[PDB]
C-alpha cells in the first residue's frame, strides 16, 4: 500500500487550518500551482491501518488530487519543504 | 488593423536575388550528382553552402528587426491613416493663405469662411450641426464653387470630396431628397 | 526549432553530445532518445527509468546497431526523421495546453513518429510503443447534478466558471447590469 | 524475413549524410524518381535481429517507400549501382 499523497486545497486558509494540529512522523511539502495550493505528504513506516486512518483527517481539510507528483517537482512552485505544515503553524496560529 | 499591420510591415532588403542564384546552384548540384561527377559538384555543394550561411546572417540579422517593433501610439495611430497637430491646425490658422492660393480676389469671402470653420473646428459651435452652414451670394464664375473645392481639399483632404445638387431639379412638391 | 524548457533545450543539445560521443555524423531519433535518459531528471527522463530503461541498457542496443565512428563531426545536422520528431513534440503539446515544449513532449513526439531507430531500440528492448506513451501520461494531469446534460458546450457555465476566482475585472455597464 | 528494402529521401543531401557512415556487408543502389531520390538496400545473409537493427539507422535519414522495387528497375533513373552509398562518400564528405 502506498505511503505518499498529494492533496489540493481550494483556498490557502484551508492549509493554515490543517497546520493547527499534529503532523506526526509526517514529512510534508507544499506547492503552489494553478492558483490552488497542493500539499505533498510522506509517511515513513506506518501500518496500513495507521495510514488509511491519518489520511482521513487530512481530507476533512483537502481533497486528493489525481496530479502526478512529478509534475509539481518540475513545473510547480515550491513554498515549503519537508516540514510544510510545521512552518505555517509558526507564522499563523496566533 | 494595427494588431497585425505592424508585424505585417515588419516582415516586408534587396536580398531577394541571392535566393534566385542559390536556387539554381542546388539544382546545378543535383543534376551532376546523378551523373557523378561528384567532385564536379561537391565543388557545387561546398558552393551552395557558402551562399547558405550567407543569407542567414541577414535573416538572423532580422532579429535586428524584432527590436524595432515596442508598443506606444507610434504603432497604434498609423493604423488609422487608413480608417480616416502642427500641420493640421496649421491648415487652420493658415487657412486663408491656403484658400487664397486657389481662390483669387474674394478675400472678403475667404476670411469669413476661414474664421467660421476655425470657430466650429475649435470647440465653440454645437457638434451635432454641420461644421459650417453658408450662403454664397454673388455673380457667376466668380469663385462660388471654386471656394467649395478648395475647402474640400484643405479641410477634407480631396478637392473632390464634394456633393453637388442643382436645385433646378427640386422646384415642385416633389421635393424628396 | 523554437523554444522549450531548459530541460528540453538541454536534452536536445544533449543529443549532440551523444552525436559525437560515438562519432556518428547525423543525430537521428536514436540520439534524441539518449538525450532524454541522459539528462536523467526530465519527466521524459523519469519515465524511461520506469519502463526499465536506464542509459546502460539503451546505449548498448544502439552501439549494437551503429558503433563508431567517423570523427568527421563536420558540423553536423539532424536526421530528417528526427526533424519530424521535433516538429511533432511541438504538436504533442498544443495537444496539452502546455504553452511550452519540454522533456516529456519530445518523448511523446518520438512515439508518434515511430518509424525510426529509437522506436526499434525499444521494440527490441521488449517495450511495445504504447506501454511507453502510457508511462509519460501517468505523470501529468488536469488542473454535479443536472449539469450533466446542460453541461455540454453548449454551453459553459458563466457562474461556477467565474466562481473559480478565474474571473477578471469586469468593467461595465455597471448600471447596465443591475 | 525479407532482406531487401527501398527507401525515399526528401532531399538529396539526406543521402550524402547517410553516406558518411558504414554501409557494411550492404550492397546498395540509388535511383532518382518523382524528383525525390529512392535508395535500394540489399543485405546478404544477416540475422533478422541484425537487420531489423541496421535498418533502424537508415530510417534516421529516410523513410521506407511502399514502392514496388521493379517500378524503379524499369521506369526509374539509375544513378549509382551496387556501391551507391560508398560512391557518394567519395565525392562529398570533405
Swiss-Prot record, chains A, D:
GO BP annotations listed: establishment of competence for transformation; negative regulation of establishment of competence for transformation; negative regulation of sporulation resulting in formation of a cellular spore; sporulation resulting in formation of a cellular spore
Recorded GO molecular functions are: protein-macromolecule adaptor activity
Sorted alphabetically, the keyword list is: Competence, Sporulation
Report the superkingdom from the record: Bacteria
Where does the chain cross the membrane?
Answer: none
Would the keyword Secreted be found if you checked this record's keyword annotation? no
Domain observations: The N-terminal domain has binding sites for ComK and ComS and probably for unfolded/aggregated proteins; the C-terminal domain interacts with ClpC.
Q: What does the similarity note say? A: Belongs to the MecA family.
State the protein's purpose: Enables the recognition and targeting of unfolded and aggregated proteins to the ClpC protease or to other proteins involved in proteolysis. Acts negatively in the development of competence by binding ComK and recruiting it to the ClpCP protease. When overexpressed, inhibits sporulation. Also involved in Spx degradation by ClpC.
Q: How does it assemble?
A: Homodimer.
- This protein is called what? Adapter protein MecA 1
Organism of this sequence: Bacillus subtilis (strain 168)
Q: Which residues of the full protein are shown?
A: 125 to 218 of 218
UniProtKB/Swiss-Prot annotation, chain C:
Which residue intervals define the domain Clp R in the entry? Answer: 1-142
- Where in the chain are disulfide-linked cysteines found? none
Q: Which organism is it from?
A: Bacillus subtilis (strain 168)
Instruction: Give the start-end ranges of region Repeat 2.
Output: 78-142
* Location of the region described as Repeat 1 in the Swiss-Prot/TrEMBL record: 4-69
The protein, known as = Negative regulator of genetic competence ClpC/MecB
What is the role of this chain?
A: Competence gene repressor; required for cell growth at high temperature. Negative regulator of comK expression. May interact with MecA to negatively regulate comK.
**Family, per entry:** Belongs to the ClpA/ClpB family. ClpC subfamily.
